[PDB]
DNA sequence: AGCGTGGGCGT
DNA sequence: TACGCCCACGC
C-alpha cells in the first residue's frame, strides 16, 4: 500500500506514490528546484513557489464570506483559520 | 496576521 | 513524470 520507502538516515517515512517520496526527500537534501523570478528565493516545491509569488503582487483570491467583513487572503488555509475565528 | 513548508490527495 | 489543490503546524 505504501511501497515507496525513505531510506535516509534515521528516517522511516513511506509513501503510496513515488512522487511523494521524491518530494519528501528534498527535505533531507535541501534541494530547491524552483526559483522566484522576482526575488530569486528558491523553493522545494512548485506549488509553494506559486503561493509565495502572491506575496509580491498582493493577490488574495480567498474572501471571507462573513457579511460586512472585507478580509481576503492569499491562501485557502488562511481563510479557513479566519472563518474558524468568526464562529468561535 | 502572513507565510514557509511539511502532509495527503486529485488529476 | 507534471501541476496544483486543501490541510495543518510552527514560527
Ligand atoms: Zn525521509
Ligand atoms: Zn519572491
Ligand atoms: Zn471575516
Residue numbers in the entry: 350 to 437
What do the study's own words say?
The three ZnFs of both proteins bind in the major DNA groove. The C-terminal fingers (ZnF3 of Egr1 and ZnF4 of WT1) interact with the 5′ triplet (GCG), the middle fingers (Egr1-ZnF2 and WT1-ZnF3) interact with the central triplet (TGG), and the N-terminal fingers (Egr1-ZnF1 and WT1-ZnF2) interact with the 3′ triplet (modified GCG). We kept both strands of the 5′ GCG triplet in an unmodified state and modified both strands of the 3′ GCG triplet.
For the work described here, we used a construct of WT1 containing only ZnF2 through ZnF4, which was structurally analogous to Egr1/Zif268. All four fingers have R at positions −1 and −7; three have E at −4, and one (in WT1) has glutamine (Q) at position −4 instead. The principle difference between the two WT1 ZnFs is the residue at position −4, which is E in the low-affinity ZnF4 and Q in the high-affinity ZnF2.
